[PDB]
Design a protein around this nucleic acid. Structure first.
Ligand SMILES: Nc1ncnc2c1ncn2[C@@H]1O[C@H](COP(=O)(O)OP(=O)(O)OP(=O)(O)O)[C@@H](O)[C@H]1O
Ligand SMILES: [Mg+2]
Ligand SMILES: [Mg+2]
Ligand SMILES: [Mg+2]
Ligand SMILES: [Zn+2]
Ligand SMILES: [Zn+2]
Lengths: 117, 114, 65, 56, 49, 263, 56, 391, 147, 162, 30, 42, 56
RNA sequence: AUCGAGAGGG
DNA sequence: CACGTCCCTCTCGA
């Protein structure tokens, strides 16, 4: 039940688009400069100008301690794209392009998102 | 014509108990109290001073319909911790908060004079 | 039709200020908005409460019984 | 008019073609003219068409 | 503020509604239908004022 | 000082400004509501008309008499006409008023708020007095009579709150405001060029410090310090408007306990 | 199905010519070829108001 | 009663005040608004005519019409306007507001959805919270203009197992669309299931709009900022592009079209040089107006309003058409006694260069008043043609 | 109805505490739906509401006269002259919870008219009921307790 | 009006505003004329007076000069019921054609002698108010003296969904 | 000064004059 | 009241608002129904 | 055509309609007064006899 | 009451 | 040469 993905990305591109509280994003994986990543991020809680994870814990109802990051989101994946996964956070989307950690990440319909400094 | 007599906004009827506790069958350790003859004067107030209850899970209220002065209040709390008590601990918290406002307004008020 | 006791959207009493407002322009000869302003009507719902009202009772008491 | 017809590659494609409209209806005679498509001709006068081409 | 112009008949106030009419003693030229034999018509509504 | 603190800005016989430090908005609003509707007050409720020859119909003059303010300082010692035990009304739930008016003067004869006299016993408690804030000490203008008009009626006042009818509304307008600099993002301003320049800074803006542009909005900020101002039609002084607003809301949350232990 | 097609055809016609002033002077094909021609079509009538032969 | 739908069977719910009260979504079937509108009520007398009403003519039984094989009920007015306002990414709902929403759903599973955003401050997406009212088991798929699998402007729509994936909810999603949410829910779930959906959304969406609020003033019919400086130019050249043909045929040089005379031809080109320009100031209007515009917002959701409306109110009214053709010459060879004789310009023939914001002229108004009547006549005199064809 | 063909019935009635409120304490006598505007195209309504807004404030009968050069950009200059939102709007607060509204409300007076259509004087209902003289079916009209 | 090289002057403006404490003057003084619809056929009228001789709202070709008459004020094309419409130029024309018939449906004091006449049915408003928005045509409909409605604080906004 | 022409505001005094002679029921009475 | 006294009945398009109606009849005041543009106001 | 193809009927009603966002789709808020004038001939049976006598 | 006439509403 | 949508609400006159 550990991290399903660990990698870091770069100050790539920031987009509002009539949206003034959330921004789409691009990112180049610093491990292998070939792993694209694009997603929305509430720039209100977390501006941008650079870490990432996935994981799946730490079902059942929700209540108000494995937070070690800053901006955290919960969502579900909705597509698998060969060459890249697509995730959604209620309304916020995300696309991680790759081919390598096919085992770490999985086709689940559940996962959190963590960002560090 | 078909308009209800104004006073039915606060005066109870035959047998109506102001509060009526029903158990939320859906989620366990939860209750829904039907406050009769009340509105967002009390509704929004109690819900908010329940949210601050550390051991309280859910706290919401809907005025079933603007015609009928009444609202349902659903309350859920940590296991064992009776929600009926969570309402009492939330209520006194309001009155004790209110009472301090009165005395802090009365003294501040008793000073200035223009 | 006579001064409305208490403003509609406020509750502010304005039934007493008729013959005061009226005499703030007959006697003192002031600007209507400045008279309303001097009769203590900061919120415009009261301002309209006096300004728009026409005192038709005066044209009523002209008949006999 | 731009009429849609299937290209040799099978896909439907937009190939224009010329058409003439009238302010009169003599179907029984205008269809027998040489130099048109007597299968595509059309008059909005459905009454005249019932008379020329049968009820169906 | 009552400006009148109306009658009082057995109690009720009866008003006279302006009845419009194409004037008389005037000459007018009109076409006619496609199947009509007449090509055109000249009309005058002869009446004394 | 004890939690929900206060701070008076201004105060007079009609209006009363004050800031509420460290208080829940959902509560403060609920006090605004209580102030408006659910504070007890007296006013006319039944008008027996002996003779009315005025240009104003009966119930038209009726409609307002209740709308007229009545003294209500010591209202808590007058039971609700419905809660008392007497056939109809009496002295421990009603304050009988009489308004007799004949116009002798050829010059039109005004009937006022002062012109109503009480034909009941007050029992030495402030009640039923037609609140007169007038410049010339005349009160609210109810009617106008000619050379021989007349008006004989009798008003039976009763305890009541604005909920039954807003003529028992002890409060006028309740100035409500908080977070003058939209730091909490509780409203998405509307503009065709500039949001700030098109919307004027409120009066209660000098009291909170400006936002400081080069900053990151802190979600953790919450509603605090509410800029209020309560007006009194008269029925109850502007202290009790807020004191009994605070105090009759108390009884609301407390009667919820009353029936809470009956379960 | 018949009393239904009737309404299904008649409702939009009667209802389209009820929302003609929501745009004031627009006309369009409300009372140009819709209500008119349709009346022709139902009554049949040989004296068609615009006999056209769209000849391919 | 021009409709199978204009007579429906409802459950009685006795209530005070002397009005019949009906759910706002069942307006479109009867074509009812709440402006002095009046409705009949009939009551069965036997248990069989009863069942006959509840087993055939029930309102939810009638949710999808044979008329146009589509839903004839759907979200409208308040609920629609606030449901795209709600279903956004900028639109977030905090906890004190979220528990209220969750409760209003009577068929609620009583389980708090894990918040789309957790830790900085537990927040929920507009669509995310909306999804508990959409019943698990629903799958819908829509692609708009450029809608991708990673929606750009929250484009299109995709609901998977009754939760929203991406995209803003608008008329297409939640209206009476051929393949809209209503349609899909009534087929793959049931008539009465969808009905409860109608309420489950009107109870939530409306609640959110209550505390978000929404208005509309003259501010929303204002472009003025170099888009009114842009539009005015479009109407200037249009008076020259129509003046072009105006002088062309004044010296015979009018290459008359084949079939339509020089006059007919001229007007046909002239008439669309205004309608194609006035319609171009209506998209110039739509452009300047931000996504914070209110008139613009109601039309984007499909609440109320159309492309023309924004044009006429903010940009330009346009030519007035009586009996199809433009404003004619009631006076001898002239259109008004304020106009030169034989004047063919667009100003004389009934073109309203001004918008409703700017305010028409003494002339612009009258013509616009002529054209309206022509309409007011259709809506009151030419209805007897269509009521008879139906009979 | 306002004086621009703005008909409409009362869907519900509210007290001031249930009602939305400006910050000055002002409350709306009337809440008309924003959707009655684009389709009805009554911009004169919006302008009468903005004009009457100033008319009350400065206290001067506002010239709604038709064909004069009175702009909205000037009225707004007068409405910001009195310190209000130049376009009629005002940050208003949710009556129930007391928090603001994530949108501002075009406010201000508007001349409305009570029209001779009272629901109480229109409502009718019947069972059994009187019966026509010759056709032995229900009689026409509310006046006659008919069907 | 009639024009040459405007017949009526600010002098005649005082020949009237004083007399308020004549019109047939302007008729016999040859400054005005009763033109029926046929006599219109052979005349040319100037819309606004000063605006039709030699930012805001857009205008047209006033430069074409040959005028014989002038329009008193453009407003005067309206009937009584439609005259009380504020800003009818900023309104879809049918809206105007409605409020025209609804102003006749409204309430308010219709005559000052209602107390003394026995008319079958009749409504009177409790507190009529002269409107905040007034046309200059109103002073002549005696409308500020016998209003038909009330200036209500109107909040255009969504709230409950009622 | 009996000289200048007329303004848009001046026309209103003219209209005011028209009614003080003919009135609103002008044609009905005449 | 006034509107009723300046009313124009026209017997059984004669409905369309005409140009010669400028200045003599109201372009807006007329009833929606079997009278729209037929019965006008002055 | 208006005595047999269409009749006036008992057990009928009519009033002004207002919209309700807190009602259910398949419902109709009927004013109390209408529900006191509108009836339904229920038949007495063990299933309803206890409810029925209370109403009476 | 019944026939006729008219004015409104959706 | 016969049709000319649907209901609903009031007023008055042999
Ligand atoms: N003459 C008529 N015949 C039949 N039905 C009519 C007639 N007039 C109106 N209706 C019906 O009543 C409604 C008329 O629309 P309504 O008068 O309610 O105006 P609206 O569309 O709300 O106008 P606005 O654009 O001013 O909002 C429609 O539902 C229509 O079917
Ligand atoms: Mg309607
Ligand atoms: Mg409507
Ligand atoms: Mg209509
Ligand atoms: Zn006020
Ligand atoms: Zn007693």
């Amino acid at each position: 039940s550990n991290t399903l993905f660990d990698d870091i990305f770069q100050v790539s591109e920031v987009d509002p688009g009539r949206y003034n509280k959330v921004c789409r994003i691009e990112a180049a994986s610093t491990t292998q400069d070939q792993c694209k990543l694009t997603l929305d991020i509430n720039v209100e809680l977390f501006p941008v100008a650079l870490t990432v994870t996935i994981a799946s814990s730490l079902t059942r109802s929700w209540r108000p301690l494995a937070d070690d990051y800053d901006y955290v989101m919960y969502g579900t994946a909705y597509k698998f794209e060969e060459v890249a996964v697509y995730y959604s956070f209620g309304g916020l989307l995300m696309r991680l392009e790759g081919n390598y950690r096919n085992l770490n990440n999985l086709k689940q319909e559940n996962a959190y998102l963590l960002i560090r400094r | 014509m078909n308009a209800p007599d104004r006073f039915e906004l606060f005066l109870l009827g035959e047998g109506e108990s102001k509060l009526k506790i029903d158990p939320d069958t859906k989620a366990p350790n939860a209750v829904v109290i039907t406050f009769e003859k009340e509105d967002h004067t009390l509704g929004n107030l109690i819900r908010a001073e329940l949210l601050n209850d550390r051991k309280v899970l859910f706290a919401a209220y809907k005025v079933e319909h603007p015609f009928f002065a009444r609202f349902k209040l659903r309350i859920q709390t940590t296991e064992g911790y009776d929600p009926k008590d969570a309402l009492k601990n939330a209520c006194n918290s309001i009155i004790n908060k209110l009472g301090a406002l009165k005395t802090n307004f009365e003294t501040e008020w008793n000073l200035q004079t223009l | 039709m006579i001064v409305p006791v208490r403003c509609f959207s406020c509750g502010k009493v304005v039934g007493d200020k008729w013959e005061s407002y009226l005499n703030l322009l007959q006697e003192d000869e002031l600007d209507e908005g400045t008279a309303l302003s001097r009769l203590g009507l900061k919120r415009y719902c009261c301002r309209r409460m006096i300004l728009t009202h026409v005192d038709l009772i005066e044209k009523f008491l002209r008949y006999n019984p | 008019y731009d009429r849609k017809v299937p290209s040799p590659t099978g896909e439907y494609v937009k190939e224009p073609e010329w058409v003439l409209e009238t302010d009169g209806v003599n179907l029984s005679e205008v269809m027998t003219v040489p130099g048109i498509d007597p299968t595509r001709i059309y008059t909005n006068s459905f009454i005249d068409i019932m008379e020329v081409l049968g009820i169906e | 503020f009552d400006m009148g112009g109306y009658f009082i008949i057995n109690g009720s106030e009866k008003v006279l509604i302006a009845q419009e009419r194409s004037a008389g003693n005037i000459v007018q030229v009109f076409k006619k239908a496609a199947p009509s034999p007449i090509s055109h018509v000249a009309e005058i509504r002869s009446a004394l004022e | 000082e004890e939690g929900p603190q206060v701070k008076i800005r201004e105060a007079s016989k009609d209006n009363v400004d004050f800031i509420l430090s460290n208080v829940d908005l959902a509560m403060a609003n609920s006090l605004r509501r209580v102030m408006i509707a659910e504070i007890p007050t007296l006013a006319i409720d039944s008008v027996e008309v002996e003779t009315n020859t005025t240009v104003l119909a009966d119930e038209f003059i009726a409609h307002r008499l209740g709308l007229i303010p009545l003294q209500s300082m010591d209202i808590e010692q007058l039971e609700y006409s419905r809660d008392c035990f007497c056939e109809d009304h009496c002295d421990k739930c009603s304050v009988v008023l009489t308004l007799q008016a004949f116009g002798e003067s050829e010059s039109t004869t005004n009937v006022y708020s002062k012109d109503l006299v009480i034909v009941s016993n007050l029992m030495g408690r402030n009640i039923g007095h037609p609140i007169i804030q007038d410049k010339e000490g005349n009160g609210v203008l109810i009617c106008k009579l000619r050379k021989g008009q007349e008006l004989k009626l009798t008003c039976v006042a009763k305890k009541g709150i604005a909920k039954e009818h807003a003529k028992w509304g002890p409060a006028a307008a309740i100035e409500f405001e908080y977070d003058p600099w939209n730091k909490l993002k509780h409203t998405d301003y509307w503009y065709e060029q500039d949001s700030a320049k098109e919307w004027p800074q409120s009066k209660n803006c000098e009291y909170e410090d400006p936002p400081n542009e080069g900053d990151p909005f802190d979600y953790k900020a919450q509603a605090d310090t509410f800029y209020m101002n309560v007006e009194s039609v008269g029925s109850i002084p502007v202290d009790q408007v807020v004191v009994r607003g605070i105090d009759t809301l108390q009884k609301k949350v407390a009667s919820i306990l009353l029936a809470l232990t009956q379960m | 199905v018949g009393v239904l097609a009737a309404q299904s055809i008649g409702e939009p016609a009667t209802q389209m010519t009820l929302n003609t002033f929501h745009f004031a002077g627009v006309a369009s094909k409300k009372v140009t070829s819709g209500v008119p021609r349709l009346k022709e079509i139902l009554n049949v009538a040989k004296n068609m108001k615009t006999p056209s032969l769209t000849v391919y | 009663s021009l409709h199978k739908m204009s007579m429906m069977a409802h459950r009685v719910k006795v209530i005070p005040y002397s009005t019949f009260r009906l759910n706002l979504s069942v307006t479109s079937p009867y074509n009812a608004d709440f402006d002095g509108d009046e409705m009949n009520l009939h009551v069965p007398q036997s248990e069989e005519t009863r069942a006959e009403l509840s087993q055939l003519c029930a309102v939810p039984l009638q949710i999808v019409s044979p008329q146009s094989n589509k839903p004839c009920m759907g979200i409208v007015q308040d609920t629609l306007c606030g449901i795209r306002k709600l279903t956004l990414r900028d639109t977030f709902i905090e906890l004190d507001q979220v528990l209220n929403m969750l409760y209003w759903v009577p068929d609620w599973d009583g389980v708090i959805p894990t918040p789309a955003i957790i830790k900085p401050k537990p927040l929920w997406s507009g669509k995310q919270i909306l999804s508990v009212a959409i019943p698990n088991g629903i799958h819908l798929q829509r692609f708009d203009e450029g809608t991708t699998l990673l929606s750009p402007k929250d484009n299109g729509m995709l609901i998977i197992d009754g939760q929203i994936i991406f995209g803003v909810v608008e008329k297409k999603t939640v209206g009476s669309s051929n393949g809209g949410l209503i349609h899909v829910v009534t087929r793959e779930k049931g008539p009465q299931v969808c009905a409860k959906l109608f309420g489950n959304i009107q109870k939530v969406v409306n609640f959110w709009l209550l505390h978000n609020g929404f208005s509309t003033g003259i501010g929303d019919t204002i472009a003025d900022g170099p888009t009114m400086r842009e539009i005015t130019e479009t109407i200037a050249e249009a008076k020259k592009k129509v003046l072009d043909v105006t002088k062309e045929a004044q010296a015979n040089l009018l290459t008359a079209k084949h079939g339509m005379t020089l006059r007919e031809s001229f007007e046909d080109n002239v008439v669309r040089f205004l309608n194609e320009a006035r319609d171009k100031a209506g998209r110039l209007a739509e452009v300047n107006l931000k996504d914070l515009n209110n008139v613009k917002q109601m039309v984007m959701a499909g609440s109320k309003g159309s492309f023309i409306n924004i044009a006429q109110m903010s940009a330009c009214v346009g030519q007035q058409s009586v009996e199809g053709k433009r404003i004619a010459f009631g006076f001898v060879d002239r259109t008004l006694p304020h106009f030169s004789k034989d004047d063919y310009s667009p100003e004389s023939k009934g073109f309203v260069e001004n918008s409703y914001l700017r305010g028409l002229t003494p002339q612009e108004f009258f013509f616009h008043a002529m054209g309206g009547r022509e309409g007011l006549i259709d809506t009151a005199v030419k209805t007897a043609e269509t009521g008879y064809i139906q009979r | 109805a306002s004086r621009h063909g703005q008909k409409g019935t009362i869907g519900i009635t509210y007290r001031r505490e249930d009602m939305p409120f400006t910050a000055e304490g002002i409350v709306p006598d009337l809440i008309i739906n924003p959707h009655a505007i684009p389709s009805r195209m009554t911009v004169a309504h919006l302008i009468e509401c903005l004009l009457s807004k100033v008319a009350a404030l400065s206290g001067n009968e506002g010239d709604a006269s038709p064909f004069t050069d009175i702009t909205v950009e000037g009225i707004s200059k007068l409405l910001r002259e009195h310190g209000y939102q130049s376009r009629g709007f005002e940050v208003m607060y949710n009556g129930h919870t007391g928090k603001k509204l994530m949108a501002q409300i075009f406010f201000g007076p508007t001349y409305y008219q009570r029209l001779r259509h009272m629901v109480d004087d229109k409502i009718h209902a019947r069972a059994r009921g009187p019966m026509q003289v010759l056709t032995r079916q229900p009689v026409e009209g509310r006046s006659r307790d008919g069907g | 009006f009639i024009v040459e090289d405007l017949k009526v002057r600010k002098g005649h403006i005082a020949k009237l505003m004083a007399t308020e404490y004549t019109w047939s003057s302007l008729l016999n003084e040859g400054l005005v004329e009763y033109i029926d619809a046929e006599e219109e056929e052979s005349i040319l009228i100037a819309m606004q007076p000063e605006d039709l001789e030699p930012a805001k709202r857009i205008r047209v070709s006033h430069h074409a000069t040959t005028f014989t008459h002038c329009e008193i004020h453009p407003s005067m094309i309206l009937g009584v019921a439609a005259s009380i419409i504020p800003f009818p130029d900023h309104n879809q024309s049918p809206r105007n054609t409605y409020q025209s018939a609804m102003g006749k449906q409204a309430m308010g004091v219709f005559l000052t002698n209602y107390n003394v006449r026995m008319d079958t049915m009749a409504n009177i408003l409790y507190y009529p108010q002269k409107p905040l928005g007034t046309t200059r045509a109103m002073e002549y409909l005696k409308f500020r003296e016998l209003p038909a409605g009330q200036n209500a604080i109107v909040a255009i906004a969504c709230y409950s969904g009622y | 000064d009996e000289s200048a022409p007329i303004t848009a505001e001046d026309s209103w005094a003219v209209i005011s004059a028209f009614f003080r002679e003919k009135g609103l029921v002008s044609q009905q009475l005449d | 009241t006034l509107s009723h006294l300046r009313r124009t009945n026209t017997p059984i398009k004669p409905r369309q608002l005409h140009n010669t109606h400028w200045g003599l009849v109201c372009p807006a005041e007329t009833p929606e129904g079997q009278a729209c543009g037929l019965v006008k106001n002055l | 055509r208006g005595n047999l193809m269409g009749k006036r009927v008992d057990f009928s009603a009519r009033t002004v309609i207002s919209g309700d966002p807190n009602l259910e789709l398949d419902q109709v808020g009927v004013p109390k007064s209408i529900a006191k004038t509108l009836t339904y001939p229920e038949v007495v049976t063990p299933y309803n006899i206890d409810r029925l006598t209370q109403l009476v």
